[PDB]
């Protein structure tokens, strides 16, 4: 009987309630100790929530995009596709610079093979692995191809092509339903996921990591205010009215680390925003993973912090390449929870700073201990930027 009441409670309110209690609970153990106990008996629940969010990304990014690409004419897709990718590149070019500026203000493979990897040598192999970006390419290519079949004069081809789209569309609908199911468990997951971090971050609240959080989070505010809002004003969409509609998406996106997990509610927001279907149904699932604004800002500051942690000095040009390559090296894969920590890992690997070195591990471990809330904000801009991009693309 109680379970029925729990589910009937609005999901977003549960999401916030779990967050507040978890942070309060975690900070209590920060002073009472038992940081090991929470990491043992509480964190696994958070890990399960993270695992669930990671699961959603691959089926959604494939099935949703195939439906989205195949649901509109290829000509319109090209117009929208070019517009949306250009939008992210501009904003990411802003986020990458914005993070570098905030990094110093607070002071806490070649290009081609990266591009060639957009074309999977085995589409099934791409799906089997977590290679989100090439899976997007195959999805759109498959989606566009289906439309050409649906217009084919051959009756058998049209019927067979239609059935394939329906099967994939059913998968896309099912995953959205699974997302709603996951969101019901999110309040339990979020509470545990934030309780652990706030337990062993209960100390150092005003340390260097605090400035790292300040550099990022205030960086997010500027990202929203100085990039999204200005862009919305330039295109004639009242940012205040827009963000009012996006309140549900931002909060669900903010607390739930995954942009994909908040995708169905993000689509719901777009519908209420008046954006024509077939534009938000495609850009948003793409945006959940292709968006680079949050990760670039995250790496701009966090990477700078690591450099100082090892007593190194990064000139602006050198730092620009480090963060820019990380962004380029992960044009996708931005929808998984805790992307920054995972994405920062290879940045250290790319440089001669393997995790084997205790100093690198120690400095990185400190970042990992804070990634829980640092990445929480990251999804806020990531799921706000794609909302902006969807709005701007919709004109």
From Swiss-Prot:
Binding site for L-aspartate: 257-259, 295, 336, 375, 382
Subcellular location: Cell membrane
Binding residues annotated for Na(+) 1, in chain numbering: 287, 291, 382, 386
Lineage: Archaea, Methanobacteriati, Methanobacteriota, Thermococci, Thermococcales
Protein name, UniProt field: Glutamate transporter homolog
Disulfide bridge positions per record: none
Effect of residue 378 to A: Strongly decreased affinity for aspartate
Record-linked InterPro entries: Na-dicarboxylate_symporter, Na-dicarboxylate_symporter_CS, Na:dicarbo_symporter_sf
Main location: membrane
UniProt-listed Pfam families: SDF
Ranges annotated as spanning the membrane: 11-29, 41-61, 80-102, 109-141, 178-199, 212-232, 279-301, 373-393
